[PDB]
Amino acid sequence: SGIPHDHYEPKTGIEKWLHDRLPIVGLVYDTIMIPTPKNLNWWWIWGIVLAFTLVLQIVTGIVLAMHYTPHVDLAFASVEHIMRDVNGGWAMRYIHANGASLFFLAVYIHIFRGLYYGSYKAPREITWIVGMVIYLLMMGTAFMGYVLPWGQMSFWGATVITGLFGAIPGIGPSIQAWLLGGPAVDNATLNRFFSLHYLLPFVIAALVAIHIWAFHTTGNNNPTGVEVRRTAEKDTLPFWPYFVIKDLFALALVLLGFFAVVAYMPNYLGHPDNYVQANPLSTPAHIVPEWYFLPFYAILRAFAADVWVVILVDGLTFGIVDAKFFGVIAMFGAIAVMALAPWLDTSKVRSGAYRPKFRMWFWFLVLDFVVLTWVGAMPTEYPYDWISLIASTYWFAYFLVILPLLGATEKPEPIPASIEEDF
Amino acid sequence: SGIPHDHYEPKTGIEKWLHDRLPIVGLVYDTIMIPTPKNLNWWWIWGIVLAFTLVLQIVTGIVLAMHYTPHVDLAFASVEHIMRDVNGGWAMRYIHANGASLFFLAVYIHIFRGLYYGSYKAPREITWIVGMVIYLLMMGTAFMGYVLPWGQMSFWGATVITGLFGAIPGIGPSIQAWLLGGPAVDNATLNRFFSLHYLLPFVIAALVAIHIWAFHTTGNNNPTGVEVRRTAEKDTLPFWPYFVIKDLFALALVLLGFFAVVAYMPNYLGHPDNYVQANPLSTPAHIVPEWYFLPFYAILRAFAADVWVVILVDGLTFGIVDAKFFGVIAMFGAIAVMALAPWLDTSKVRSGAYRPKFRMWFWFLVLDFVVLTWVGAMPTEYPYDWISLIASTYWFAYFLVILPLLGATEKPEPIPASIEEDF
Amino acid sequence: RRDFLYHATAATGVVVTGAAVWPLINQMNASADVKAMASIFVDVSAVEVGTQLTVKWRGKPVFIRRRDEKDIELARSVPLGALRDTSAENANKPGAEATDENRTLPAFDGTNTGEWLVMLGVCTHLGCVPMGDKSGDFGGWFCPCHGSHYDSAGRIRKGPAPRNLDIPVAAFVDETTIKLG
Amino acid sequence: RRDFLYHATAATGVVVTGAAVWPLINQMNASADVKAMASIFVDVSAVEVGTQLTVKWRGKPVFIRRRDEKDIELARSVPLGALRDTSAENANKPGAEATDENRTLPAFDGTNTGEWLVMLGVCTHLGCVPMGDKSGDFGGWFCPCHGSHYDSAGRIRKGPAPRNLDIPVAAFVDETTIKLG
Amino acid sequence: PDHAFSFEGIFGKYDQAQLRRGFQVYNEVCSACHGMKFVPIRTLADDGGPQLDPTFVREYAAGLDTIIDKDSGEERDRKETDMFPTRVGDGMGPDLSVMAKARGGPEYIYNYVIGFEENPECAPEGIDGYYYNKTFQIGGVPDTCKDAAGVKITHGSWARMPPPLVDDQVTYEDGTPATVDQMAQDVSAFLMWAAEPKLVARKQMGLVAMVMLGLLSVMLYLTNKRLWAPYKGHK
Amino acid sequence: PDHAFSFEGIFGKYDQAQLRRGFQVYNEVCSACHGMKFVPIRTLADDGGPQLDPTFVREYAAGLDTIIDKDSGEERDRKETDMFPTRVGDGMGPDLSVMAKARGGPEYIYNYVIGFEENPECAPEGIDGYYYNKTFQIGGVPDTCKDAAGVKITHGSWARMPPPLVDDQVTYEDGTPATVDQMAQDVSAFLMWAAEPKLVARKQMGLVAMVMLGLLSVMLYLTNKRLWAPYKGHK
Numbered sequence A, B: 001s002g003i004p005h006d007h008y009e010p011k012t013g014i015e016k017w018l019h020d021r022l023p024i025v026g027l028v029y030d031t032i033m034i035p036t037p038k039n040l041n042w043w044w045i046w047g048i049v050l051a052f053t054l055v056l057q058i059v060t061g062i063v064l065a066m067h068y069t070p071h072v073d074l075a076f077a078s079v080e081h082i083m084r085d086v087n088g089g090w091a092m093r094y095i096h097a098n099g100a101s102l103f104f105l106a107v108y109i110h111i112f113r114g115l116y117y118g119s120y121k122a123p124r125e126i127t128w129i130v131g132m133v134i135y136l137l138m139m140g141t142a143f144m145g146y147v148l149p150w151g152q153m154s155f156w157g158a159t160v161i162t163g164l165f166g167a168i169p170g171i172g173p174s175i176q177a178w179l180l181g182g183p184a185v186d187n188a189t190l191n192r193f194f195s196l197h198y199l200l201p202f203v204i205a206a207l208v209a210i211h212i213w214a215f216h217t218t219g220n221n222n223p224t225g226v227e228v229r230r231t232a233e234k235d236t237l238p239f240w241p242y243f244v245i246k247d248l249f250a251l252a253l254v255l256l257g258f259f260a261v262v263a264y265m266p267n268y269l270g271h272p273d274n275y276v277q278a279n280p281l282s283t284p285a286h287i288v289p290e291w292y293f294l295p296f297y298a299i300l301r302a303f304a305a306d307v308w309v310v311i312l313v314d315g316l317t318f319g320i321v322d323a324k325f326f327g328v329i330a331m332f333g334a335i336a337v338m339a340l341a342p343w344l345d346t347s348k349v350r351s352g353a354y355r356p357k358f359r360m361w362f363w364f365l366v367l368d369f370v371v372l373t374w375v376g377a378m379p380t381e382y383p384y385d386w387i388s389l390i391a392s393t394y395w396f397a398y399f400l401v402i403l404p405l406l407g408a409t410e411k412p413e414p415i416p417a418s419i420e421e422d423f
Numbered sequence C, D: 001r002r003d004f005l006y007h008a009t010a011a012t013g014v015v016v017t018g019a020a021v022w023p024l025i026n027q028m029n030a031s032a033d034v035k036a037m038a039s040i041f042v043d044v045s046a047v048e049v050g051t052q053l054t055v056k057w058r059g060k061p062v063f064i065r066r067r068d069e070k071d072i073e074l075a076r077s078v079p080l081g082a083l084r085d086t087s088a089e090n091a092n093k094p095g096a097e098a099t100d101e102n103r104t105l106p107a108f109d110g111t112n113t114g115e116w117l118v119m120l121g122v123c124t125h126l127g128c129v130p131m132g133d134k135s136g137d138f139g140g141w142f143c144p145c146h147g148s149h150y151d152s153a154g155r156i157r158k159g160p161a162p163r164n165l166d167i168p169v170a171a172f173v174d175e176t177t178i179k180l181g
Numbered sequence E, F: 001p002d003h004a005f006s007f008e009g010i011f012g013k014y015d016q017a018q019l020r021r022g023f024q025v026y027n028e029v030c031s032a033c034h035g036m037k038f039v040p041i042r043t044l045a046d047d048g049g050p051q052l053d054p055t056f057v058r059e060y061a062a063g064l065d066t067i068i069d070k071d072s073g074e075e076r077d078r079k080e081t082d083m084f085p086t087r088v089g090d091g092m093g094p095d096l097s098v099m100a101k102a103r104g105g106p107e108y109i110y111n112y113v114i115g116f117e118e119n120p121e122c123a124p125e126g127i128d129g130y131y132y133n134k135t136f137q138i139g140g141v142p143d144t145c146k147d148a149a150g151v152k153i154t155h156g157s158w159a160r161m162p163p164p165l166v167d168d169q170v171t172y173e174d175g176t177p178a179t180v181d182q183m184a185q186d187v188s189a190f191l192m193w194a195a196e197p198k199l200v201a202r203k204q205m206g207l208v209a210m211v212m213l214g215l216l217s218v219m220l221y222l223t224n225k226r227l228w229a230p231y232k233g234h235k
């Protein structure tokens, strides 16, 4: 059971004088020969993808910062200095910019893999909490970063996603001014964002430290509602070399596609308007902040008192909870409820591979995510308003009511024993 | 023996559900209730001082970077923007600038405490190695940082301490250009230095991580040549609350003095010429890089073929080893030999409190350090040249020959037993 | 005493910690160079009355647009009913009803109001810049960030934006100038 | 085979890693905007021959100083013996001996050398700027960074600096100009 | 058909004669109003695009406007190391440094320059000082051409730029019919260069990396199939 | 004796009348050649120093040179938000923004302005265009005054600045003998302000922190003495 196999430091004198600093003991006993089940599909790779992508972003950023100058008058020029003069330039920038896209794409699949195979269910709450914390940090990071080029979309995205904090009453304008460094956006905001943007990744790495510490102490989830049967465990092959090699193969494929993009379709995920300098006096059409924030942008700009299911007219009972504040609360709740999940699913069961109704609702949820992604880009004119309202309502409904009802009446399936599934 | 007292997680349900993430187990069992001897004097505090100073510097820097603009045309102006407009300004800058001074002062006492009480002697080699690595990183950091204000001393200090790398043959100019971003100093160097300067502290923290991991696995030295007698150990009170409170008291005193300086004598340790903008066309008199690099500056500019003990005329046997390269090697060796110490002292003994000859030689070494500090500021005219040569020669002599001879014939003292020294 | 001394040491440590933390949260506030926040003299100077005029100030645009009769009549024909924000955000006067007579502007040092209207070109939803030049579904301004329809006089309509376009404190400089501040 | 396949996978991984690392070490090299490194036309234009003239170029100063007879005679009276660097660093000619006849400069398009001397104002020790205007213990230049005494013609003396002050490639523009590059 | 360029694909390293033609046009036509500050003059020798002769570059540079200085205010000789000039206002337009990315890009410029036909049969009078363009979409439209809800019934809108070229505005030294269409294509390619000069290097890197990573991935697949063999053989 | 200032110590928050006098002196004498770019004009209302009336500040600002713009080249009215002007060359000197720190500082300025006496009895002819000072140390010296190894026998050296003031150059509105010494002291204090405006806040913070930390340290000493009591009582 949970064979650590510390190696007893019996190799030789080198492995015996290393009794001063244990380090190799840690690596070997724990982070390399960690028994993992055999039943792992191709959905348990994306964590390696995320770690590599994080390293990539940190490196490329440390390189760019050697040529980026945070200032309204010299940011654009420095970016062009990069893409033209520097030796590698375009590569670093395109790899930095697009890799953010892959990062978020990979976390999406990392998260939805989790919702299916009960990875939030006990005893794996801490991992979930830490993951939501990370998600928040990395969203804030990417936001701070999209601003640095001082293009045109930078300015206005910052403007609105800071007016949010100002929507709330009493302490809105104060926070807004304390965050922007002033009444509106200017170089001060740029300096804050650069610093902050150059600091959070390390916090993320530490949090990834705790993320990795947790699911090593707590066994990796597995396609089944079963554990490694610790009591000797013919199942649960080790990590190295088997799963290391599997993950590296998938990672090679992913990097292949990523570099093909970088080299042929690099400006595809971007907004052309970010290639024109900023004008605080003129706003372009369809700001469309980005593609990894459209869901929440839509959940925000949906509630506007423009439907018979408009709960804003009812929330107006209290004269303080206006629309804006309502949408902001709705977004914060869209995330808080995803974090609260493990204490809402009242099921003494596990992976939805044995819960059909859950399968249907979950695929509807994935569809809802895609729809929200597609709607945040389209205007607030009919019919898109009804669509956004329906989708947000279903998100909240799933995460609040649907899981309890299932946990109550959702066991028409024969659960599998013997995690050694030699089929 | 080595009582960890994991606490068994018997407190309550909170301390029992924390069996998902051990964290509190680590803190309690290891990093708080770490048995430390009773025989500790006031020289075992400076590590807490260093940790706090590092945190202070990191914080103040993260704040400054919100207003500093890396560019030749806007650095000085941004520094003045800080010291005038910003709310706190002068405080952050003076605390950042001077705290570096305290940092190095504190590491000096941390290191010399070590040389006395055989803290480099086995089984504490890894700590020493890691400490020298750190010292290097933090020297490089402070150097990169003194440049950012783009004053006058910045430029020329950078110029010379980069011409060093160019002294060596074959791969000197290439490295020089690859480090400066060009033939000479300009904005590119500034960007590199800012980035680098804003990144190494985290590496230092990690290295401090390993630094703290090591001497927790390996017992804290103690005033004597004795261990905690693991086999139950009435000696070795715990860390918390006793030594925590002692260190915090000393730290309060130190911060008191430090803030008195910051508020009354802040520009004392500085160079006024760093308050005039840079002129690549005019060099001031007595550049005098700083005060924590004068020893090595002197060891460098001492060997010049101007004494009957001039080994440069002899090293000229090989036409490649000229003077400059000789001084550079001498400096690198001045540090490498301090790192090699634990394998040069051939003594099966410990703290020099029981080795008189060692006491005398060690106080001579401290005097040599002070002298080198005082000499790097004075010209290379007679008699200072002879002084610098003598001092460097004694440094090398100590660390190479003196310790072996002692380890041979240096045991006229009764060593103390029973680390419980109830005198 | 045990309790008193221990708790007092803890309290003093906490107080010092807070006194050290506050400035790390104060430096991010508006600095003195941002404190200035003063006025601007924009000269109307025959810009062909009826299309628009925009000028930068305080980091935001200040819209100075003449009036087109059709725009005017549409304005003056708006009863307070069915008007989201009837407060006439203009700070040059009290909270008087959001009426075009009060909402257009001072009268050149003369006596007339249905000819000029200078408001802050900042959407009250989240601070975007609406597009002018007769746009939207009400012959006024349209915000492209979320779709808020403004009217001729600038009062909010058809969108999430809660209130109309504010009007800063401004007076005239004897028939060719505007004072913003 | 076990050995072949495993070792080949490792080799390919290493190769890819290196191909990815190299640019992270290449970007820090001089960029194309630093590649330029071209020439400058400085006009002597009667600056009162005998004191000095300094101009910025390539990020370093280029010293153009006329000659003072006492400085000249001290120069021409220096035998190659006791001269640290006798190579005449000047790149406008071969490695001919560091003699004042070759070491002063071209002759205005005429025939004379003991009147002008333009060298690179960069100490060969570590690149500091020596102080001019008759300084040091040899009536020339003095480096304040470590104490290197230069002579009248710029040849190094009395210090760690190994070689004299180099002389870039320069020709005259017909009696009032200098071409640096 | 769509008149695809050379670079439109996995290959097509910027046929350079096209770019020299675009340069002949840009400096003689578009430069009168437009600028390219984000473009150094020394790039007309760098590989990939117009590999002109450096000496001609220095000549053409000295023959341009006067960019004064950064240290001592004095009208210099506009050395190549400087950037192309900037036309800012009073009847002038934006900067074309990266206009090929702020819009499939070059096709916009081609189909924009192409198309300035007379005013349609909805508003033949048109507007004073504004001219009509088939493809610009961010211009004003008269009320006579708008529908019932503000949308325009015209394909394009009214742009403030006049027609830049006639039937035979300039001569090509290489020998080629210099009609409007060829000039438009050429200048579009030149602007795409000015925006993406490092295109060919992009493509070559992409090829090299695709190859090396396919190799690595194949080898890893073999290693995986091997290691996992004794556990996937009976089923 | 040494004519210590007010701020020379643990107290001395910049007696403001002295600074107003120094301002009368600086704008009417030193400003002709020197500048203070690193100094905003609005600081003449901020506390600590000259708490002048804002309206006078705006007037004095509009009455200065013309600082053109940063966005649209056009000679503006020079609003207070801008910085003091800059005199750069052609018989002009450095910037006095932080000259009080690039040298005990203000004493240098006092003992420098003080001292321009005639040429000594070693070189009475002196030099053409250069004037003599007894305290500047970074100026040239004639060969007649140097020793055998280049060192000067004079106290100071020859500075390019002329004597700035005579016996009664300007009047003080408050009523005070405006001799040279008082003006020198006043202008020195003004420059020290221009360099260290946040001095008084520095001192008050230092006091507060010394106090709080002494308190904390005393309490920790008591706690230590207590905890370590049962182990240090028999000896």
Ligand code: HEC
Pocket (backbone or CB within 6 Å): E025, E026, E029, E030, E031, E032, E033, E034, E091, E092, E093, E094, E099, E109, E112, E113, E136, E137, E139, E158, E159, E160, E161, E162, E164, E187
């Ligand atoms: C002045 C006589 C011009 C010359 C000659 C050329 N251009 Fe221009 N251009 C000019 C103006 C005033 C504008 C702004 C138009 C507006 O309505 O805002 C432009 C615009 C362009 C654009 C941008 C179009 C867009 O979608 O915003 C392009 C791509 C452009 N012009 C191209 C172009 C070329 C290739 C030229 C030389 C052949 C050229 N223009 C000449 C003014 C003038």
Ligand code: HEC
Pocket (backbone or CB within 6 Å): F025, F026, F029, F030, F031, F032, F033, F034, F091, F092, F093, F094, F099, F109, F112, F113, F136, F137, F139, F158, F159, F160, F161, F162, F164, F187
């Ligand atoms: C031109 C007529 C001047 C006026 C009036 C004032 N100053 Fe000046 N100053 C001037 C020059 C050309 C120089 C450079 C001198 C040199 O030899 O390099 C200076 C220098 C100073 C300095 C710096 C001295 C030093 O050690 O470098 C100071 C502190 C100074 N001047 C002060 C000063 C004051 C207070 C004035 C008004 C009372 C003033 N100067 C007027 C030119 C001129």
Ligand code: HEC
Pocket (backbone or CB within 6 Å): A057, A058, A059, A060, A061, A062, A063, A064, A065, A068, A079, A092, A093, A096, A097, A100, A103, A138, A141, A142, A145, A146, A147, A148, A149, A197, A198, A201, A204
């Ligand atoms: C060491 C510095 C650094 C790190 C670490 C870093 N970046 Fe950046 N980032 C930059 C710089 C510099 C820019 C501006 C240059 C650019 O846009 O490429 C930038 C810009 C961006 C952009 C906008 C790209 C563009 O071209 O508009 C995004 C998105 C972004 N960062 C996201 C991230 C995310 C997400 C992470 C990690 C979680 C990250 N970055 C890590 C330095 C860094």
Ligand code: HEC
Pocket (backbone or CB within 6 Å): A043, A044, A045, A046, A047, A048, A050, A051, A054, A107, A110, A111, A114, A119, A120, A124, A127, A128, A130, A131, A132, A134, A135, A208, A211, A215, A218, A219, A220, A221, A222
């Ligand atoms: C909001 C949720 C969430 C986020 C965001 C998240 N994780 Fe996870 N992660 C999980 C969960 C749940 C598991 C499953 C743990 C288990 O099975 O015991 C997991 C597992 C892992 C694993 C091991 C198994 C696997 O799925 O590969 C790795 C490695 C990992 N995460 C890395 C990362 C990294 C690196 C990041 C970010 C840079 C990240 N994760 C972000 C929740 C998250």
Ligand code: HEC
Pocket (backbone or CB within 6 Å): B057, B058, B059, B060, B061, B062, B063, B064, B065, B068, B079, B092, B093, B096, B097, B100, B103, B138, B141, B142, B145, B146, B147, B148, B149, B197, B198, B201, B204
């Ligand atoms: C987050 C950024 C950051 C960190 C971390 C940081 N600094 Fe700095 N440092 C700066 C900035 C910004 C400046 C320039 C402003 C200034 O000089 O105060 C600077 C300047 C300096 C200076 C010159 C001070 C002066 O005023 O001339 C020194 C010395 C220095 N740093 C040393 C250090 C050392 C040693 C460390 C930690 C080991 C450190 N710094 C940590 C940001 C930082």
Ligand code: HEC
Pocket (backbone or CB within 6 Å): B043, B044, B045, B046, B047, B048, B050, B051, B054, B107, B110, B111, B114, B119, B120, B124, B127, B128, B130, B131, B132, B134, B135, B208, B211, B215, B218, B219, B220, B221, B222
């Ligand atoms: C080059 C040597 C060196 C450097 C530099 C160094 N250390 Fe140490 N450190 C030591 C040695 C040796 C010991 C003694 C360990 C023992 O007694 O087991 C030690 C002990 C310590 C201790 C515990 C006992 C004590 O002396 O306080 C702390 C805490 C500590 N170091 C922190 C730091 C921090 C933080 C830094 C830098 C930011 C640092 N040290 C830099 C060598 C070094």
Ligand code: FES
Pocket (backbone or CB within 6 Å): A160, C123, C124, C125, C126, C127, C128, C129, C143, C145, C146, C147, C148, C159, C161
């Ligand atoms: S920001 Fe103006 S409507 Fe959303």
Ligand code: FES
Pocket (backbone or CB within 6 Å): B160, D123, D124, D125, D126, D127, D128, D129, D143, D145, D146, D147, D148, D159, D161
């Ligand atoms: S740098 Fe010129 S002598 Fe040391």
